[PDB]
Amino acid sequence: KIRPECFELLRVLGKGGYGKVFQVRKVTGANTGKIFAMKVLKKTKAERNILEEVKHPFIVDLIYAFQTGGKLYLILEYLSGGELFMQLEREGIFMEDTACFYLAEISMALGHLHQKGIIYRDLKPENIMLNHQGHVKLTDFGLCKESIHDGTVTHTFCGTIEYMAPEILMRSGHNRAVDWWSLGALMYDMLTGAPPFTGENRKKTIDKILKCKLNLPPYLTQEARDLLKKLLKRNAASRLGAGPGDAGEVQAHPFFRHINWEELLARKVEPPFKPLLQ
Numbered sequence: 001k002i003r004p005e006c007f008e009l010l011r012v013l014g015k016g017g018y019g020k021v022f023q024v025r026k027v028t029g030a031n032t033g034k035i036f037a038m039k040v041l042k043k044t045k046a047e048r049n050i051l052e053e054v055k056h057p058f059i060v061d062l063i064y065a066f067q068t069g070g071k072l073y074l075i076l077e078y079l080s081g082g083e084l085f086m087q088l089e090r091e092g093i094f095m096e097d098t099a100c101f102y103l104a105e106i107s108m109a110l111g112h113l114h115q116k117g118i119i120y121r122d123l124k125p126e127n128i129m130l131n132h133q134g135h136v137k138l139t140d141f142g143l144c145k146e147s148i149h150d151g152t153v154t155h156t157f158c159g160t161i162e163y164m165a166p167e168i169l170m171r172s173g174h175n176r177a178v179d180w181w182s183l184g185a186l187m188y189d190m191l192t193g194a195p196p197f198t199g200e201n202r203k204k205t206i207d208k209i210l211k212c213k214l215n216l217p218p219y220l221t222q223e224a225r226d227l228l229k230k231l232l233k234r235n236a237a238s239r240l241g242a243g244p245g246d247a248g249e250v251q252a253h254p255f256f257r258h259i260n261w262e263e264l265l266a267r268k269v270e271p272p273f274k275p276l277l278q
């Protein structure tokens with residue numbers, strides 16, 4: 001019988017209009033002393049269902065869920081490695097082997113989601129956590145983490161849209177192909193220092209993304225350039241990964257040729273950065 005009193009609050013991990021996340025310590029039971037992330041929501045149904053349905057090394061684990069008063073409590077594994085964002089921000093630009101590692105782990109997580117009919121939509125690097133070893137954990141399954149909200153209804157444009165596919169921005173209907181686009185935008189950000197389509201303002205940024213005139217930096221390897229070219233396409237159906245082979249298609253691309261997927265999945269590959277050493 002789990003209740004809020006079973007946990008002590010340690011610090012705030014994040015707050016927005018639609019929930020708050022705490023680092024907490026369990027103080028009862030066999031897991032006495034163990035550290036978790038606690039998300040509290042004001043009652044969302046998709047979020048819980050998603051987290052209960054997925055089980056994968058590169059996706060955050062849900063340990064407990066319960067509702068007391070009007071609040072929903074989600075107890076997740078505590079991820080101490082921070083946001084992928086912070087590594088990018090410190091490094092400026094990743095070496096290709098660095099980028100390859102992260103993108104490869106993300107692709108497996110995306111594959112798992114898609115098999116469960118789940119679409120991640122937004123792979124901006126603040127939406128990817130690292131665990132204590134430095135491996136990827138997809139975490140962003142909730143409504144919106146913002147405090148100021150675009151549109152008096154839906155939460156597509158609240159944060160940056162720089163990693164979202166044209167067809168999402170147009171609201172013209174979409175599928176799992178948007179995730180492969182977003183993987184490309186993230187990849188582009190890793191290898192060049194900024195997402196592919198940026199404007200002086202929101203309106204300009206939308207227009208650039210819709211026009212999708214890709215600038216392939218010449219200093220990248222041919223494999224990296226070819227993958228970016230095949231991910232960042234306005235025609236969703238014709239992106240790598242958009243076909244029946246999904247993640248398998250992307251993982252077969254020459255940019256990932258040095259990846260042992262079995263070793264990757266089992267997390268036996270050493271991450272480029274170790275959060276414990278930071």
Ligand SMILES: c1ccc2[nH]c(C3CCN(c4ncnc5[nH]ncc45)CC3)nc2c1
Pocket residue numbers: 013014015016017018019020021037060076077078079080129139142144145146
């Ligand atoms: C509303 C407003 C701001 C928010 N910031 C989040 C983030 C916060 C950091 N996250 C985690 N950190 C550590 N262990 C974690 N385990 N699981 C997640 C997690 C990831 C989510 N969710 C929000 C909801």
Ligand SMILES: [Zn+2]
Pocket residue numbers: 144145146148149150154155158
């Ligand atoms: Zn919002």
